[PDB]
Amino acid sequence: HMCDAFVGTWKLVSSENFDDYMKEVGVGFATRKVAGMAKPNMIISVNGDVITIKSESTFKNTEISFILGQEFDEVTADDRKVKSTITLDGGVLVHVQKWDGKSTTIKRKREDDKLVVECVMKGVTSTRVYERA
């Protein structure tokens, strides 16, 4: 019953500061523009101890599967090769990505009927709100 409130299909309904977050991460111009225009659906599922998160859009379809607290290697939608760890901390799914001596964190939280994503690197944050599909 780990992650029950996260499971489902979610659709992006608002975004703030995502372009600047992507700049901070090092995403190039054309990818920022096409990725920023995407309207992804986030599909979260759990089977035993394995959580799967899919992100599907016209820009890219990605999928990660993982066990909480157990590192994995990921190729991100912007083509970084990162070492990722996802944990549940006080009911928040916390995804840390490490690459080239850098780090960024993506948090997912259930707030009312929404799933709120907060992306942070250095002092640059972006908040993206998802609703049930």
Curated annotation (Swiss-Prot):
Keywords: Acetylation, Cytoplasm, Lipid-binding, Nucleus, Phosphoprotein, Transport. GO terms for cellular component: cytoplasm; cytosol; extracellular exosome; lipid droplet; nucleus. The modification N-acetylcysteine is found at residue 3. The keyword Disulfide bond does not apply. One of its GO terms (molecular function) is hormone receptor binding. Belongs to the calycin superfamily. Fatty-acid binding protein (FABP) family. Forms a beta-barrel structure that accommodates hydrophobic ligands in its interior. This is Fatty acid-binding protein, adipocyte. It comes from Homo sapiens.
